Paper text:
The binding mode of GSK1278863 and related compounds (and to a lesser extent, Vadadustat) to 2OG oxygenases is of interest since it has a different scaffold to the FG-2216 related inhibitors. A structure of GSK1278863 (2.45 Å resolution, P41212 space group, 1 molecule per asymmetric unit) with FIH reveals binding to the metal via its amide oxygen (trans to Asp-201), and one ‘pyrimidine-trione’ oxygen (trans to His-279); the GSK1278863 glycinamide carboxylate is positioned to form electrostatic interactions with Lys-214 and Tyr-145. Interestingly, the oxygen of the pyrimidine-trione coordinates the metal trans to the distal histidine, as observed for Molidustat when complexed to FIH. Overlay of the FIH.Zn.GSK1278863 and PHD2.Mn.CCT6 structures reveals an angular difference of 20° (degrees) between the binding mode of the pyrimidone rings of GSK1278863 and CCT6, likely in part due to steric demands of the cyclohexyl rings in GSK1278863. FG-4592, GSK1278863 and Molidustat all manifested no sign of HIF-1α Asn803 hydroxylation inhibition (at least up to 100 μM), consistent with the isolated protein assay results (IC50s for FIH are >100 fold higher than for PHD2). The lack of inhibition of FIH by the clinical PHD inhibitors is also notable (and consistent with cellular results), since the extent to which HIF target genes are regulated by FIH activity (and FIH inhibitors) varies.
The transcriptional activity of the HIFs is regulated in an oxygen dependent manner by 2-oxoglutarate (2OG) and ferrous iron dependent oxygenases which catalyze the post-translational hydroxylation of HIF-α subunits. Two proline-residues, Pro402 and Pro564 in human HIF-1α, in the N- and C-terminal regions of the oxygen-dependent degradation domains, termed NODD and CODD, respectively, of HIF-α isoforms are efficiently hydroxylated by the HIF prolyl hydroxylases (PHDs or EGLNs) under normoxic conditions. In a second 2OG oxygenase-mediated mechanism of HIF regulation, factor inhibiting HIF (FIH) regulates HIF transcriptional activity via 2OG dependent hydroxylation of an asparagine-residue in the C-terminal transcriptional activation domain (CTAD) of HIF-α isoforms; such reaction reduces binding of HIF to transcriptional co-activator proteins (CBP/p300), which are histone lysine acetyltransferases. Here we report studies that inform on the activities, mechanisms of action, and selectivities of the PHD inhibitors (and related compounds) in clinical trials for anaemia treatment, i.e. Vadadustat from Akebia Therapeutics currently in phase III, FG-4592 from FibroGen in phase III, GSK1278863 from GlaxoSmithKline in phase III, and Molidustat from Bayer in phase II.
Numbering used by the authors: 15 to 116, 119 to 349
Write the structure that this text describes.
Amino acid sequence: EPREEAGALGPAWDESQLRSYSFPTRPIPRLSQSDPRAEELIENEEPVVLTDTNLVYPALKWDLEYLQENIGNGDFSVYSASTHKFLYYDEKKMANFQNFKPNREEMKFHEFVEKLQDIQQRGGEERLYLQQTLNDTVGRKIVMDFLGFNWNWINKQQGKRGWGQLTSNLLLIGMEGNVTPAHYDEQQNFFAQIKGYKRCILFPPDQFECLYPYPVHHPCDRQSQVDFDNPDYERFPNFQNVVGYETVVGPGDVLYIPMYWWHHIESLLNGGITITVNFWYKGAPTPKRIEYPLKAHQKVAIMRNIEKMLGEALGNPQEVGPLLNTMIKGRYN
Ligand SMILES: O=C(O)CNC(=O)c1c(O)n(C2CCCCC2)c(=O)n(C2CCCCC2)c1=O
Ligand SMILES: [Zn+2]
């Protein structure tokens, strides 16, 4: 259901810019910050798109030119990929899995604009994705925009939910067609879209069985093993039962991605560059009186801890698998 831009500017996007996948989805609600329904969705840790937060209102004028002029001289982490399917490799965990081979490159902002402009010409199949946490090295005008964010609203949300401290603000600038594969994060996230359009497909924590994350010690920890473009239903049979929550966010929209919810993010094809700012918050602390049965994301937390501990106990991540199979084979299956 593509939205109609004001001023009769025509459809902002059409379904031809969306990639096709095998699973069905239901839409994420697009609500107003003043709507109590959006307030309970955040309280019940369910996704919602807020359309009128003014959270990054001063940033809605950002583009490659404005940023290059005022972002300043600093190092920005840039990730390269030979195709649309990006993928992340925890550098620290590269040691555990020696066989795997991957990617990232540091550079000043103008260098990124040159590469993005260089690849613009030639129709190069390569794609890039800038992802850098905001720090003090940003120029004057960018700090003014940063201060112009709606801190009143988001800070009130932080207290209302008892969340932890704002861990970081992440600036994401991507090329059209970029795909962030399905993965889950362990912190609460307000996904503030600025430039371009991004299709966000979320899956609840209870669909862990359908998305098959890599081992915790694997560099791709928290990412799905399933190739959405070509699912291996033999290895990943329960992916045929996956059902996602879908939406397309545009400038001014804020998507709440609750902690441990999977998200598959893609910048629309032929939609130009996309710009996003994320607000990361440590989740609310675990209550003192645990209510059973546990939430799905609590069981995911338990599973993560077991794998982590067996890695230390056995003194080798590679032994975690064999010992877990020995434990269940013919005893719990
Ligand atoms: O694209 C968006 O709008 C939202 N993107 C994200 O939340 C990303 C993300 O959470 N992650 C990792 C976070 C830590 C745990 C493993 C996944 C990414 O690597 N990436 C990219 C993945 C490809 C390689 C560079 C980093 C994310 O985008
Ligand atoms: Zn994420």
